[PDB]
């Protein structure tokens, strides 16, 4: 039990799925599938070790 | 006709004739304005011990 109010999580706007997706790395996953769409050197610079380790978005 | 306004002369001598009356021990043992929960705990136990003691007196 940690006293709090649910108006400062990743929601507080949009809805629960906005918070839930960010809990599951939704913003990171959507970054690569956007960065890869635009450029390749930009995608390699930002996620260099992600590409090498084999972590798909 | 001016007068002398005030003097402490012979006031400590007067105060020590029948000297500083100390408060009794009953003054230090008062419990007014104490903690509400602490007061509730004491009253709850004093009612528990009193009832048990009065029941034994009633049986005999």
């Amino acid at each position: 039990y940690v006293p709090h109010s649910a108006t400062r999580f990743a929601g507080a706007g949009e809805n629960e799925e906005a918070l839930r997706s960010r809990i599951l790395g939704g913003h990171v996953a959507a970054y690569m599938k956007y960065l890869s769409g635009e450029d390749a050197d930009l995608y390699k610079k930002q996620f260099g070790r992600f590409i090498a380790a084999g972590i798909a978005p | 006709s001016k007068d002398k306004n005030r003097s402490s002369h012979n006031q400590s001598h007067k105060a020590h004739r029948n000297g500083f009356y100390k408060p009794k021990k009953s003054a230090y043992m008062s419990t007014k304005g104490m903690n509400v929960q602490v007061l509730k705990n004491t009253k709850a136990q004093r009612k528990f011990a009193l009832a048990k003691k009065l029941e034994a007196k009633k049986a005999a």
Partner: protein, 165 residues
């Protein structure tokens, strides 16, 4: 002739200690006061809310009640020819743990240590140790010998008056 204000004549009494301004210690709010303890009222001018009266500054009192944010303190006040009991509720920022019984408290420990041994010796048969000797004023010093092998002599006489100019 002074005025009858609540905090009159506190230019030096209520001033903070030199290089002692700003926030206070953290142990001030962490110290655990219990009923029966001895405390010292020390009005901290940095906290204007709940500031005790200037007459109780430096007075030593006994804790009589503990409240969620304030500590009850009971001190003695002197009136015309009698003494009255003053009951106050003071936040920990204005009181201080008194050390009046520091000497007394260690004497109880010294006696309790000896008494605890006297229950380890009587049943086992060994002679029982005695309690520590009571305090006494500085007694007259006894006779003693002073060796003449490591002694030295310096003569004492009135000094000839020498001018400082």
């Amino acid at each position: 002739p002074l005025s009858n204000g609540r905090n009159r004549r506190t230019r030096k009494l209520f001033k903070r200690p030199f290089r002692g301004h700003g926030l206070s210690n953290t142990s001030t709010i962490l110290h655990t006061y219990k009923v029966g303890d001895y405390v010292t009222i020390l009005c901290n001018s940095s906290i204007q809310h709940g500031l005790p009266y200037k007459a109780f500054h430096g007075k030593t009192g006994r804790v009589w009640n503990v409240n969620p944010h304030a500590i009850g303190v009971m001190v003695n006040k002197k009136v015309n020819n009698r003494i009255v009991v003053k009951r106050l509720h003071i936040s920990p920022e204005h009181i201080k743990p008194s050390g009046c019984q520091k000497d007394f408290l260690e004497r109880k420990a010294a006696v309790a240590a000896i008494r605890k041994q006297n229950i380890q010796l009587k049943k086992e048969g060994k002679p029982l140790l005695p309690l520590p000797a009571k305090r006494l004023p500085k007694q007259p010093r006894p006779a003693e010998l002073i060796k003449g092998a490591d002694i030295k002599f310096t003569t004492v006489a009135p000094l000839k008056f020498e001018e400082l100019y």
